From a paper:
Additionally, we solved the 2.7 Å resolution structure of a variant of the LMCA, LMCA (CDRL3SAR), where CDRL3 is mutated from the wild-type 91YGS93 to 91SAR93. The progressive rigidification of the CDRH3 is further illustrated by the crystal structure of the LMCA-CDRL3SAR. Rather, it is likely that there is induced fit where CDRH3 adopts a more extended conformation upon binding that enables the acidic residues of CDRH3 to interact with the positively charged apex.
In this study, we combined negative stain and cryoelectron microscopy (cryo-EM) single-particle approaches with X-ray crystallographic studies of early and late autologous Env-antibody complexes to decipher molecular details of the co-evolution of [name] Env and the immune system response over the course of several years of chronic infection. Comparison of Ab-Env complexes at early and late time points reveals that, within the antibody lineage, the CDRH3 loop rigidifies, the bnAb angle of approach steepens, and surface charges are mutated to accommodate glycan changes.
Numbering used by the authors:
A (entry chain B): 1 to 52, 52A, 52B, 52C, 53 to 82, 82A, 82B, 82C, ...
B (entry chain A): 1 to 27, 27A, 28 to 94, 96 to 212
Write the structure that this text describes.
């Protein structure tokens, strides 16, 4: 079908460079104005840049936070888009989608004739993730957030000082799922991530039920099962 | 470059209600260059409307677009459980810019947060750092204020908070704030308090603890 597949994203040092590629399929790529659009973690959509078709002159435009460091090119013989990123920053850490934007009104003529007479569509990719930091791979540290001896009760596990994302947290090997809140990770100033997973259970249950949090980190291949009990 | 603003920042409604989102442009935008996109968590943006008023193929009929050059409007006639997401307005005239985004969340009655506080474990203490956790469980709306205090001294710059997505059953939010200190700074003081200010609370609720 019609699709855009991004590739090339990964971990880059704050001073390094990286080339993202975007393969197009299913439509006449040479006639479409292409664009790179990024989205930082927990933030909105940010337009990185745009390149026009060879017919319209191939003029390229960039956003202010990106102008002077990023370049965009296209290979019509390969139906491929390229984003060369030089002098990266931590602020450049985001998911980079390759999109077509809103093309001309009659861009999709002939597209699916059995079903449609007039057709309009934009194309987006699944996006590629670019992480820019000076940190290395580090196993997570699981600390038990124990229930209050004062006293419904709440307990949990704090997963601190790990890199990179993601980390999976379960309770009693998935047996406990009600009242469980796994919060989004937070990037510390040291370049390491930290999150916390809490669960609220009846106080009496605290005396008759064992609670074990299971933390799995794929990059470090770490599995830590820690029990949570009052102090 | 034309700047796009969206109103309101957050829209709280229930399924089956009429949703109205306004996009304001710094300068007059040609109707053929404005679009409305919808994005859901962990998913690529989905083009809802192109050309201010035209509807993309496959988009349900409840999404409608209107507007002139400075003011535009995206209207959802009747909200569905799948229509609660983030909505952006984009403009292709002049330069390619997005809007701030309007979050549409399920409306429910005001619920006060349940405040809990967790001191650092002894393992983390011997590790060399102290992290104090403050948990605000099940509240609405999402707006909430957390203030850390160390022997009545208000803190700043050493706390980081994160909020969960809206619950499917409760339609409430949960917030977790972490205050990070060194072992020496943690052993210097005694009382540590977390003060919560929320719409569902008459007075800010404070949860404190002492080492021991």
């Amino acid at each position: 079908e019609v699709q855009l597949v991004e590739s090339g994203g990964g971990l880059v040092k704050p001073g390094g460079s990286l080339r993202l590629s975007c393969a197009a399929s299913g439509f006449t790529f040479s006639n479409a104005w292409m664009s790179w659009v990024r989205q930082a973690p927990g933030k909105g959509l940010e337009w990185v840049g745009r390149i026009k078709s060879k017919t319209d002159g191939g003029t390229t435009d960039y956003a202010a936070p990106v102008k002077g460091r990023f370049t965009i090119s296209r290979d019509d013989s390969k139906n491929t888009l390229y984003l060369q990123m030089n002098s990266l920053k931590t602020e450049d850490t985001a998911v980079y989608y390759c999109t077509t934007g809103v093309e001309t009104y009659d861009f999709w003529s002939g597209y699916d004739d059995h079903y449609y007479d007039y057709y309009f569509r934009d194309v987006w990719g699944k996006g590629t993730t670019v992480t820019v930091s000076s940190a290395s791979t580090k196993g997570p540290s699981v600390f038990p957030l124990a229930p209050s001896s004062k006293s419904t009760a709440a307990l949990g596990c704090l997963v601190k000082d790990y890199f990179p994302e993601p980390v999976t947290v379960s309770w009693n090997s998935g047996a406990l799922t009600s009242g469980v809140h796994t919060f989004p990770a937070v990037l510390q100033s040291s370049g390491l991530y930290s999150l916390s997973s809490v669960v609220t259970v009846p106080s009496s249950s605290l005396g008759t039920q064992t609670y074990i949090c299971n933390v799995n980190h794929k990059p470090s291949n770490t599995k830590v099962d820690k029990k949570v009990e009052p102090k | 470059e034309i700047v796009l603003t969206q109103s309101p920042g957050t829209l709280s409604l229930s399924p089956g209600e009429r949703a109205t989102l306004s996009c304001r442009a710094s300068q007059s935008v040609s109707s053929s260059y404005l679009a409305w996109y919808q994005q859901k968590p962990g998913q690529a943006p989905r083009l809802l409307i192109y050309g201010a008023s035209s509807r993309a193929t496959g988009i349900p009929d409840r999404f409608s677009g209107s507007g002139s050059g400075t003011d535009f409007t995206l209207t959802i006639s009747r909200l569905e459980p799948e229509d609660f997401a983030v909505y952006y307005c984009q403009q292709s005239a002049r330069s390619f810019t997005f809007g701030p985004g309007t979050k549409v969340d399920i409306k429910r009655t005001v619920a006060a947060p349940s405040v809990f506080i967790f001191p650092p474990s002894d393992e983390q203490l011997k590790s060399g750092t102290a992290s104090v956790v403050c948990l605000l469980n099940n509240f609405y709306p999402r707006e909430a204020k957390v203030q850390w205090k160390v022997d009545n001294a208000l803190q700043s710059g050493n706390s980081q908070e994160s909020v969960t997505e809206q619950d499917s059953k409760d339609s409430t939010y949960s917030l977790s704030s972490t205050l990070t200190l060194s072992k020496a700074d943690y052993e210097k003081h005694k009382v540590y308090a977390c003060e919560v200010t929320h719409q569902g609370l008459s007075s800010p609720v404070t949860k404190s603890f002492n080492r021991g």
